[PDB]
Amino acid sequence: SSDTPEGVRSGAGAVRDAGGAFGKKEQADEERYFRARAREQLAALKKHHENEISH
Amino acid sequence: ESTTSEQSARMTAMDNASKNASEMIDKLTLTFNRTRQAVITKELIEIISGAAAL
Amino acid sequence: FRDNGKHALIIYDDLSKQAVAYRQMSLLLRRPPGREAYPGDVFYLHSRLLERAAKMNDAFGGGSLTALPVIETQAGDVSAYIPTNVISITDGQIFLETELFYKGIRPAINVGLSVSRVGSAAQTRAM
Amino acid sequence: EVSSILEERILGADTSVDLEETGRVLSIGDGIARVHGLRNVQAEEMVEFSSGLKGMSLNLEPDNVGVVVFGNDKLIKEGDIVKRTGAIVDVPVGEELLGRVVDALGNAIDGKGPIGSKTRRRVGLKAPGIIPRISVREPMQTGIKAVDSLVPIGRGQRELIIGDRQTGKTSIAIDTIINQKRFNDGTDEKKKLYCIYVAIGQKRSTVAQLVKRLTDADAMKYTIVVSATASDAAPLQYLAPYSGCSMGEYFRDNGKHALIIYDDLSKQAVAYRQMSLLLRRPPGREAYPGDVFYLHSRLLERAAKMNDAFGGGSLTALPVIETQAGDVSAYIPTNVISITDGQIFLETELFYKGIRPAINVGLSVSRVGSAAQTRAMKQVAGTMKLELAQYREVAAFAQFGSDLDAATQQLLSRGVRLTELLKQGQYAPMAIEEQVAVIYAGVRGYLDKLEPSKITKFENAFLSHVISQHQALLGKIRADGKISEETDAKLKEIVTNFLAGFEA
Amino acid sequence: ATGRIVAVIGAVVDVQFDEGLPPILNALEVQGRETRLVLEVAQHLGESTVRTIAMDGTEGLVRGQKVLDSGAPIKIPVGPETLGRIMNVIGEPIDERGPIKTKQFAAIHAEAPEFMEMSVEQEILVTGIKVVDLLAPYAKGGKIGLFGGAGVGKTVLIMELINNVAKAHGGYSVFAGVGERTREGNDLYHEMIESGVINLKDATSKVALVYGQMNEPPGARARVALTGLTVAEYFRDQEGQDVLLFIDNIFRFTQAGSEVSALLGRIPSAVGYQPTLATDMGTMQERITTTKKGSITSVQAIYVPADDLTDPAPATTFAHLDATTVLSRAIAELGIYPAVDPLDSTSRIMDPNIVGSEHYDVARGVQKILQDYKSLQDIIAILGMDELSEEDKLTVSRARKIQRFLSQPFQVAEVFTGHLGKLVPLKETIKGFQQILAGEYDHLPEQAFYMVGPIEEAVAKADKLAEEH
Numbered sequence A: 001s002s003d004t005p006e007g008v009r010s011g012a013g014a015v016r017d018a019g020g021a022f023g024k025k026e027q028a029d030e031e032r033y034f035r036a037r038a039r040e041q042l043a044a045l046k047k048h049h050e051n052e053i054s055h
Numbered sequence B: 001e002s003t004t005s006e007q008s009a010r011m012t013a014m015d016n017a018s019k020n021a022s023e024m025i026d027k028l029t030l031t032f033n034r035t036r037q038a039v040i041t042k043e044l045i046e047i048i049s050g051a052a053a054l
Numbered sequence C: 001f002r003d004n005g006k007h008a009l010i011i012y013d014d015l016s017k018q019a020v021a022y023r024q025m026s027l028l029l030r031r032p033p034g035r036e037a038y039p040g041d042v043f044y045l046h047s048r049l050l051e052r053a054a055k056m057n058d059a060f061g062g063g064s065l066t067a068l069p070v071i072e073t074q075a076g077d078v079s080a081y082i083p084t085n086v087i088s089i090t091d092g093q094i095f096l097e098t099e100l101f102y103k104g105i106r107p108a109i110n111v112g113l114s115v116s117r118v119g120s121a122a123q124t125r126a127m
Numbered sequence D: 001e002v003s004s005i006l007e008e009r010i011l012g013a014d015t016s017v018d019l020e021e022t023g024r025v026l027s028i029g030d031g032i033a034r035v036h037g038l039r040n041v042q043a044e045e046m047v048e049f050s051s052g053l054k055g056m057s058l059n060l061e062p063d064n065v066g067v068v069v070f071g072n073d074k075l076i077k078e079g080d081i082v083k084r085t086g087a088i089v090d091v092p093v094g095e096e097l098l099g100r101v102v103d104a105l106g107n108a109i110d111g112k113g114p115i116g117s118k119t120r121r122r123v124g125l126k127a128p129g130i131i132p133r134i135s136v137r138e139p140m141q142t143g144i145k146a147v148d149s150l151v152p153i154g155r156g157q158r159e160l161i162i163g164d165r166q167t168g169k170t171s172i173a174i175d176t177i178i179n180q181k182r183f184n185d186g187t188d189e190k191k192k193l194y195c196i197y198v199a200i201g202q203k204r205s206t207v208a209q210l211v212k213r214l215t216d217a218d219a220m221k222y223t224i225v226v227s228a229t230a231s232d233a234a235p236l237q238y239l240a241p242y243s244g245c246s247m248g249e250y251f252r253d254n255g256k257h258a259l260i261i262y263d264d265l266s267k268q269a270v271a272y273r274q275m276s277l278l279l280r281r282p283p284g285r286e287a288y289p290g291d292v293f294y295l296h297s298r299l300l301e302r303a304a305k306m307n308d309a310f311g312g313g314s315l316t317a318l319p320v321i322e323t324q325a326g327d328v329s330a331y332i333p334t335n336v337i338s339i340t341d342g343q344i345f346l347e348t349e350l351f352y353k354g355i356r357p358a359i360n361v362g363l364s365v366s367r368v369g370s371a372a373q374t375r376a377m378k379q380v381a382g383t384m385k386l387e388l389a390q391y392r393e394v395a396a397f398a399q400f401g402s403d404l405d406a407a408t409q410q411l412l413s414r415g416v417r418l419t420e421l422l423k424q425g426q427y428a429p430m431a432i433e434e435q436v437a438v439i440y441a442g443v444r445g446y447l448d449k450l451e452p453s454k455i456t457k458f459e460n461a462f463l464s465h466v467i468s469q470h471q472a473l474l475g476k477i478r479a480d481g482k483i484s485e486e487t488d489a490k491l492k493e494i495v496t497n498f499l500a501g502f503e504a
Numbered sequence E: 001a002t003g004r005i006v007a008v009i010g011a012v013v014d015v016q017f018d019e020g021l022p023p024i025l026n027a028l029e030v031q032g033r034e035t036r037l038v039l040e041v042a043q044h045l046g047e048s049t050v051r052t053i054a055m056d057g058t059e060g061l062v063r064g065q066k067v068l069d070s071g072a073p074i075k076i077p078v079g080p081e082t083l084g085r086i087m088n089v090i091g092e093p094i095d096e097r098g099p100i101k102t103k104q105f106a107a108i109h110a111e112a113p114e115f116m117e118m119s120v121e122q123e124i125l126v127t128g129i130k131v132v133d134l135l136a137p138y139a140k141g142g143k144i145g146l147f148g149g150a151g152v153g154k155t156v157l158i159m160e161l162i163n164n165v166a167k168a169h170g171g172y173s174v175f176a177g178v179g180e181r182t183r184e185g186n187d188l189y190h191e192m193i194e195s196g197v198i199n200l201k202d203a204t205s206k207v208a209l210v211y212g213q214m215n216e217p218p219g220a221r222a223r224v225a226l227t228g229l230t231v232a233e234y235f236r237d238q239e240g241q242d243v244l245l246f247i248d249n250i251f252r253f254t255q256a257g258s259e260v261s262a263l264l265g266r267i268p269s270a271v272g273y274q275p276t277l278a279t280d281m282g283t284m285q286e287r288i289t290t291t292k293k294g295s296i297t298s299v300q301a302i303y304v305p306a307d308d309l310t311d312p313a314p315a316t317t318f319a320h321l322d323a324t325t326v327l328s329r330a331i332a333e334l335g336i337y338p339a340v341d342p343l344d345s346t347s348r349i350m351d352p353n354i355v356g357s358e359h360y361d362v363a364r365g366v367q368k369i370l371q372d373y374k375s376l377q378d379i380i381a382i383l384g385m386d387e388l389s390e391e392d393k394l395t396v397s398r399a400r401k402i403q404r405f406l407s408q409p410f411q412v413a414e415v416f417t418g419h420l421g422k423l424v425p426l427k428e429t430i431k432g433f434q435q436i437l438a439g440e441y442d443h444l445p446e447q448a449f450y451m452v453g454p455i456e457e458a459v460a461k462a463d464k465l466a467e468e469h
């Protein structure tokens, strides 16, 4: 099919638009990884010394 | 030894994941081609039946 | 009931067979069939039924009328001809999914997709 | 003296009486009149009603005749008088049309004045046969670095610009009109080119923006624009492709050269389908009639490269076709693909990844081949086409590749830097002598140490250098045509002198 | 000239005359009804027999009712007096406040202006929405389109531009509502009295309204949009002011002509539309233009049927629009609101000679990092997030902050959200996006940009989340 202009060819971003098993396995892996980065970037954001003097 | 045992099994397990994804890719190509013909056939009947009853 | 103060509620179960039976009644009158042999005005069929379910004000009585039409879909296709004419008429949706049924949540309601206009936030004060 | 010219016209007007072959109207509706009478009308003959509209009789039936209307049917009442003109449709043609805006029937819409053309020509003529043609050899210069390198166009070839909506299909065919200014003000008579642009079903404000773009670049003194817009009637978007080839065949018949652009042909098959199904013709696939292949074939076959015994003229045709969701396997995207020679396939994915103009060279072909390139461009681009084709094999290893062979790391290194040479801003068409120098800087190996983000800044710096400081080398590739051994060494120290002290 | 009724099938009534035949596109008054029923002529059939379309219902019609003729098409009343009034298709007032008393009557069927009556100048009209002003700027006197499916926000986004643009505007404004819910024509009459745009006590109103909704017969949902842009043609032509025009919905102009078609005797085309689809669309859309006598900004909502932009009704309006704002359900189901697709919205003035070279290299810098984010999701589905390199763990985290920063809390969506209405200016939208791309905010989590205004509130919201650990 794909070895001609006529046949169907796949583009970029076609695993998420399908919405199947691999399309759901990708959304819950971008969220369970960038949930821990909202922990380490928020715990180290409390280490401002001027806020502690106000505390 | 363990980084050779691991790097050879990554070679095999990524090889059967491209055979099973190419075995699956021909079976959906036939169903795509039956369904592509069946839609040109179906919407051709609706135009003919619309003109004949008129 | 709506013109005389009181309140009512009506359920159409269902509105798909009200169009399979309007197709056949209109084919035999020798009228030309349209898409999927449905007549040309199966939008004007439903859009004058569900447009009378109003809610009136105190200068005209204050009574209301609430509908709950039912639509049957063929194997999850919510993109067919009749299941999309009504979706652009109603105010909300309750998408029952058969994938949720056999897993064990009953009433199987896809809460991610079941949207509704809340109605000027007239839910209640406690919930 | 405004009163004098008005009194001049009405004494110069012809008020003479004649005969006619009239016939009353039976039933007017949706733009299809049925006329009873008119016993001696030919097929496809122009008639004219009582109000002032004109009509072309397509169906010659036994008891009536089906005539489409060039206007709106609110002025046609049942019981009118349909007079006969006695002639098939004809357009004015000549040299006087150059620099005007015309509709599908040759009237003037720009309001400068009426056309002073003394000749007249039919729109239903035939193509030349097999004998008056000759093979295509001269180059047609577009000015795009990716077209003239990999998918060339000769002077008589038909090349299809196919792609989706909003991907620069009109912009590729609007700087090809601008680029021929450098020949059209000079002396060499056999290198000039004349451009025609046909707009089929666009809004009036868009055409009014495109004439001003071609007025700014001083490129409306050799261009004609034929506008059949969206508001105009359904048959006026059918004549307008055949009303432009009849103006592009006057330059082919008289030893000159020409160019024509149909923008676009996928809105002519729709304006013709409406005329068919209102005349009750048997439908077919996607409700198109049985002769939509015969509609597009006899329009594109009129583009030909004539030989020296007939004049040596030419006609080049570029049709635009809009696909839907990139499916070229539809009805009309497969008719026009099998007629023409090669396609230029503009994708939408490459347009947002930075590649502008977004020409996919994996699917674009041209079957005149390398026989339409000059000797200078042919020598460097023959290796570039092989170099880019080896890159597209290994493009899928770039996202995670560091553990590969040094040849494969080299094949990625040249493919990225050859791509940056192919990008080009809008309304900046180059010359072939400047094009061959930039490709020569890349295909030799003079860029594999420069950083891939700097390839654009290096190129704009290098081009402004060689215009002012090496003008006598870009006159010995323009006039020579080929690149010799003397110019091979002379170009060799130039890109080594500039690359040495560059970063400042 | 009287005539009789000889056939009634559906909404198509056949009328046989005897001595005087009225031309096509006229008005015929049915004598014998208590209401007013107007018939519009559509075809001729020979032997003095026309075939009409009815503006109201056809119940209670009998073969033999004497029908008068007008001699002219549907002439609605027009002028300055029609401001602050709701009116019908044929010009009757349905606000129940009395007769519209004006001096000018104007037919709804008229020609298009010629080629030497077009204007050519372009501008930029600032709105205050972050997705719209950055990647697809709107223009003064330019036709704007709002695409998308059912239930993604076409009516709210067209309710937002009456909130921002229409009160700061000098001239008047016209709202034509074609084939939508009759409830939502009452939440406009009651959200424009309490904001003082419609005034019920004196002569200082600034908005007219024309309504034909989805309870009407299908001959009346296809002549209301021609009645909207007839009032809006009076202000542009007979006066000189700058007019706006809001139309929702416009897919119900095409669909309402695909229902009366098969009874008029026409073979259907592709998927079910009429054969004259792209001609009467292009006959209405050539009157909504900027001429040398005025200027009409126009925003239009365009329903796309069942999320398919290759349907023949939405995919032929693209030739008549300058700025397209394609909404999407794949963005709206993430929580990103307004769900505008950045890689599918265009404009004709995204041009570094018009918006300057600083705005231009920011717009394409956003689309390039979003499109390169799309091709990276295909790898994470098999590999995972952590097995990637450190260089493309950064272009994801820069892209996810650009997705979330585009979402802005609207003003008229307060009852959905409870959040407050923000309005970011144009000079701040560019400077917000230069700093996420250059890397000046790599020390914040993703949640600090969700539903904020300018970039100043993105760090104030960052610290307030920190203290609750």
Ligand SMILES: Nc1ncnc2c1ncn2[C@@H]1O[C@H](COP(=O)(O)OP(=O)(O)OP(=O)(O)O)[C@@H](O)[C@H]1O
Binding pocket: D164, D165, D166, D167, D168, D169, D170, D171, D172, D356, D357, D424, D425, D426, E347, E348, E349, E350, E351
């Ligand atoms: N080489 C280029 N680099 C950057 N932008 C470009 C280039 N060529 C065209 N564009 C932009 O792309 C936009 C649309 O291009 P164009 O109108 O040529 O596409 P089209 O597909 O022919 O349009 P239509 O779909 O209306 O036929 C224009 O705004 C133009 O500014």
Ligand SMILES: Nc1ncnc2c1ncn2[C@@H]1O[C@H](COP(=O)(O)OP(=O)(O)O)[C@@H](O)[C@H]1O
Binding pocket: C115, C116, C117, E149, E150, E151, E152, E153, E154, E155, E156, E157, E336, E337, E338, E339, E410, E413, E416
């Ligand atoms: N500012 C907003 N952002 C995102 N979604 C919204 C907004 N306002 C309304 N919506 C959602 O859009 C849906 C449909 O709203 P509306 O625009 O009235 O319908 P439609 O676009 O179909 O005409 C509602 O369910 C609501 O949840």
Ligand SMILES: [Mg+2]
Binding pocket: D169, D170, D171
């Ligand atoms: Mg274009």
Ligand SMILES: [Mg+2]
Binding pocket: E154, E155, E180
């Ligand atoms: Mg709506």
